[model samples]
Target: GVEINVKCSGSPQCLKPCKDAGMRFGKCMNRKCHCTPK
Candidate 1:
């Protein structure tokens, strides 16, 4: 997975979109949403 285009305030809100976008997990870095794949 790649970095999501959405800016995130934290993990909670960011995670949903990542999973929905077929990513394994979501993380916040520099207030941005990044996704990881298993």
Candidate 2:
């Protein structure tokens, strides 16, 4: 599995769509969400 960490500055909304698509969602820093390949 590939672990990807994204660092953003705002809100998780930036990655919510991706999560809704069924992607694994992780912690959000500043506003970015991290996803891991399953």
Candidate 3:
């Protein structure tokens, strides 16, 4: 398996949609979002 990282703005509006799709949530740093899977 490979882990993929998705970059997103630190906005709840932007993150909510992705989260609803079953994507894992992560903290935003320097205006960047990240996600990983094992």
**Cα shift from native, residue 30, model 3 (Å):** 1.2
Top candidate on lDDT is 1
TM-scores across all candidates? 0.68, 0.29, 0.31
Candidate 1 segments exceeding 4 Å error:
none
Error of 1 at 8 (Å): 0.7
Candidate number of the best TM-score: 1
lDDT of 1 by residue, 1-38 (tens): 47878888888877787887788687887777888875
**lDDT: which is higher, 2 or 3?**
2
Residue 5, model 1: lDDT of 80
lDDT value for model 3 = 0.45
TM-score of candidate 2 against the unseen true structure: 0.29
CA error at residue 38 for candidate 3, angstroms:
5.2
Each candidate structure's count of clashing pairs = 0, 0, 0
| Candidate 1 local Cα displacement, residue 28, angstroms | 0.9
